[PDB]
Amino acid sequence: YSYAIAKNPLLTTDTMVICTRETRPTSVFEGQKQGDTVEMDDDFEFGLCPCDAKPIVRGKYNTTLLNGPAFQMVCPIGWTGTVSCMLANRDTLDTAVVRTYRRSRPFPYRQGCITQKVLGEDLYDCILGGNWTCVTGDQLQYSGGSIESCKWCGFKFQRSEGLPHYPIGKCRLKNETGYRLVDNTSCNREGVAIVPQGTVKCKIGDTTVQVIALDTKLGPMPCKPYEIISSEKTACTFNYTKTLKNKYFEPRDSYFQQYMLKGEYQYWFDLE
Amino acid sequence: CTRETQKQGDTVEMDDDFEFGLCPCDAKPIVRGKYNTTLLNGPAFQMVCPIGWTGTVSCMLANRDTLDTAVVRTYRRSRPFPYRQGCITQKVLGEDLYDCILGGNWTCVTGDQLQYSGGSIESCKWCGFKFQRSEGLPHYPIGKCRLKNETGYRLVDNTSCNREGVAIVPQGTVKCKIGDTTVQVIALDTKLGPMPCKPYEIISSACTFNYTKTLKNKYFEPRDSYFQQYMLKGEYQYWFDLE
Numbered sequence: 001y002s003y004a005i006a007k008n009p010l011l012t013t014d015t016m017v018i019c020t021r022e023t024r025p026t027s028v029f030e031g032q033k034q035g036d037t038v039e040m041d042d043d044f045e046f047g048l049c050p051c052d053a054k055p056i057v058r059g060k061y062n063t064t065l066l067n068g069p070a071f072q073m074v075c076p077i078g079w080t081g082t083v084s085c086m087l088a089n090r091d092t093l094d095t096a097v098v099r100t101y102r103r104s105r106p107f108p109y110r111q112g113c114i115t116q117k118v119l120g121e122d123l124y125d126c127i128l129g130g131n132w133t134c135v136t137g138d139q140l141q142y143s144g145g146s147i148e149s150c151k152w153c154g155f156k157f158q159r160s161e162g163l164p165h166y167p168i169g170k171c172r173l174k175n176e177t178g179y180r181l182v183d184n185t186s187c188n189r190e191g192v193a194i195v196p197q198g199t200v201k202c203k204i205g206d207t208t209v210q211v212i213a214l215d216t217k218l219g220p221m222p223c224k225p226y227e228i229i230s231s232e233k234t235a236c237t238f239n240y241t242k243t244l245k246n247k248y249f250e251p252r253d254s255y256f257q258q259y260m261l262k263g264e265y266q267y268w269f270d271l272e
Numbered sequence: 273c274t275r276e277t278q279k280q281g282d283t284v285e286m287d288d289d290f291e292f293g294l295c296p297c298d299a300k301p302i303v304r305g306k307y308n309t310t311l312l313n314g315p316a317f318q319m320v321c322p323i324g325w326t327g328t329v330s331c332m333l334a335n336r337d338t339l340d341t342a343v344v345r346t347y348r349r350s351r352p353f354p355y356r357q358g359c360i361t362q363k364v365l366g367e368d369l370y371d372c373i374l375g376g377n378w379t380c381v382t383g384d385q386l387q388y389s390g391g392s393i394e395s396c397k398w399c400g401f402k403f404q405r406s407e408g409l410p411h412y413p414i415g416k417c418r419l420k421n422e423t424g425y426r427l428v429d430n431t432s433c434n435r436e437g438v439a440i441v442p443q444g445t446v447k448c449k450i451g452d453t454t455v456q457v458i459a460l461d462t463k464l465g466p467m468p469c470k471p472y473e474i475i476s477s478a479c480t481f482n483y484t485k486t487l488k489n490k491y492f493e494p495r496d497s498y499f500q501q502y503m504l505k506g507e508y509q510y511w512f513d514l515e
């Protein structure tokens with residue numbers, strides 16, 4: 001007997017006959033090509049492969065949701081690629097393309113798709129895709145709107161008081177749960193760094209802030225005192241003499257290492 | 273006198289030790305010199321301590337009514353007289369001992385204040401205060417110092433009382449001590465400068481204060497209201513209250 005399954009001195013044995021994509025030992029239907037290359041329109045989101053072929057997606061990223069011969073584009077924002085419908089030959093193992101869904105230019109913004117994703121506490125933009133097909137992406141920047149809180153140097157702030165400016169660092173809007181980048185201002189303020197794990201506690205507005213010194217220079221602290229401790233058990237005893245305005249005698253207060261002067265009197269303290 | 277039987281005058285050159293002279297014919301001695309050293313009585317005159325003295329002592333003979341005067345003798349000293357033995361060339365004016373550029377004894381012509389060359393010093397008066405020892409002073413001897421063998425003070429140096437912006441004045445604002453001496457001082461400027469003395473009297477003291485934790489030489493904005501400076505020690509900032 002003869003197999004009699006051929007495409008055109010010494011065949012496919014198929015993919016077409018158990019479909020009319022292509023026409024079908026010396027002594028041995030037509031090919032309907034219409035709709036071989038389908039160009040995906042700006043609003044294209046659903047395609048069905050002919051001859052019950054499997055859709056093979058060769059694109060920029062994964063947006064496709066496939067079921068048998070049918071497939072659907074889910075929020076394909078900026079997606080470029082091809083969706084080739086294929087059928088295999090059992091005896092040779094080679095595959096034949098019945099239809100090619102092509103997208104040569106990136107898809108524009110699809111209406112109803114969310115292009116923002118929250119990763120931890122930071123709100124990121126979706127460079128590619130949307131919804132569950134979103135691909136992150138550089139952190140979203142603050143353009144405007146009502147701010148709930150601002151996280152700077154690892155501390156949360158809700159007021160301009162005690163801060164160099166406002167808003168600072170990463171700030172969360174009342175609209176979103178995620179934080180948006182506002183500034184990259186340094187925590188090292190006049191040789192003092194605002195660090196989450198520090199040496200001394202101090203207050204900025206209403207927030208308890210931890211600080212570490214970089215230099216031992218006589219400089220200001222970027223915060224207000226955290227807690228003030230009154231001696232009432234440490235005692236205070238001192239000696240004083242009469243002097244001239246800003247004129248001092250040789251001894252420097254042993255504990256303070258500075259000439260203690262007020263108006264016309266010099267002081268020397270002793271602390272228990 | 274040999275004027276009546278030579279009317280022409282005589283010439284006498286004063287020697288280095290010449291002190292006494294007598295005018296002939298009872299003539300009056302007219303002294304034309306550098307300064308007053310002469311002690312005259314009728315025709316006789318005395319050169320009291322002439323040290324550096326140059327001039328002439330002309331014996332002028334006068335008649336009346338005609339005021340015509342003829343010189344019978346001229347005592348002359350062209351070169352200055354050297355030091356006369358027995359004459360004192362130092363005069364005390366107040367407390368300061370001055371040198372005699374010309375003359376000696378009561379004929380002394382004051383010169384610049386005698387300077388200290390050497391010898392045992394009794395005391396040193398500087399800025400109106402007496403000092404007998406080097407402690408608390410910039411150097412010693414200072415200003416004008418009196419020797420043991422003398423009564424007057426000799427100039428040692430010309431160091432100022434006003435330093436560094438503080439005046440050591442006999443009548444001052446605040447009392448302070450230099451060695452063992454009680455010194456009065458006045459301020460010239462209100463600059464943050466040192467006092468040239470030690471405290472006169474130390475008075476011992478209630479005292480109450482507040483403190484917080486801070487970083488090494490790192491301060492919070494409020495300066496202690498009284499002291500007007502950031503009270504810092506190690507890792508703690510202070511704020512005092514004195515009631």
Ligand SMILES: *[C@@H]1O[C@H](CO)[C@@H](O)[C@H](O)[C@H]1NC(C)=O
Pocket residue numbers: 061062
């Ligand atoms: C796309 O396809 C599958 C989805 O599970 C995965 O193996 C592959 O890594 C995805 N591609 C990227 C870039 O994540």
Ligand SMILES: *[C@@H]1O[C@H](CO)[C@@H](O)[C@H](O)[C@H]1NC(C)=O
Pocket residue numbers: 073074075112113114131
């Ligand atoms: C994207 O998600 C929204 C709900 O958040 C939904 O209404 C919309 O249909 C989704 N779009 C696609 C293409 O799945």
Ligand SMILES: *[C@@H]1O[C@H](CO)[C@@H](O)[C@H](O)[C@H]1NC(C)=O
Pocket residue numbers: 116144145146173175176
């Ligand atoms: C409201 O939330 C949306 C989230 O897409 C954001 O684009 C918008 O800017 C927020 N509103 C304001 C006032 O910022």
Ligand SMILES: *[C@@H]1O[C@H](CO)[C@@H](O)[C@H](O)[C@H]1NC(C)=O
Pocket residue numbers: 238239251268474476
């Ligand atoms: C302060 O007073 C005490 C008690 O009189 C004394 O022992 C101490 O030396 C004094 N300190 C100074 C710097 O004068």
Ligand SMILES: *[C@@H]1O[C@H](CO)[C@@H](O)[C@H](O)[C@H]1NC(C)=O
Pocket residue numbers: 308309310311312
């Ligand atoms: C010399 O001293 C004064 C002038 O300075 C004068 O009064 C005095 O009579 C003079 N002495 C004599 C003895 O002439």
Ligand SMILES: *[C@@H]1O[C@H](CO)[C@@H](O)[C@H](O)[C@H]1NC(C)=O
Pocket residue numbers: 319320321358359360377
């Ligand atoms: C100068 O005074 C001394 C001491 O009084 C005396 O010994 C001396 O003779 C006096 N000399 C003259 C020339 O007056």
Ligand SMILES: *[C@@H]1O[C@H](CO)[C@@H](O)[C@H](O)[C@H]1NC(C)=O
Pocket residue numbers: 390391392419421422
């Ligand atoms: C006092 O001593 C000094 C030398 O130190 C000397 O110059 C001076 O003439 C002396 N005076 C008397 C009166 O001895």
Ligand SMILES: *[C@@H]1O[C@H](CO)[C@@H](O)[C@H](O)[C@H]1NC(C)=O
Pocket residue numbers: 228230481482494511
């Ligand atoms: C010091 O403590 C007292 C009592 O608590 C308080 O009245 C005063 O304001 C405090 N001063 C400073 C500078 O904190």
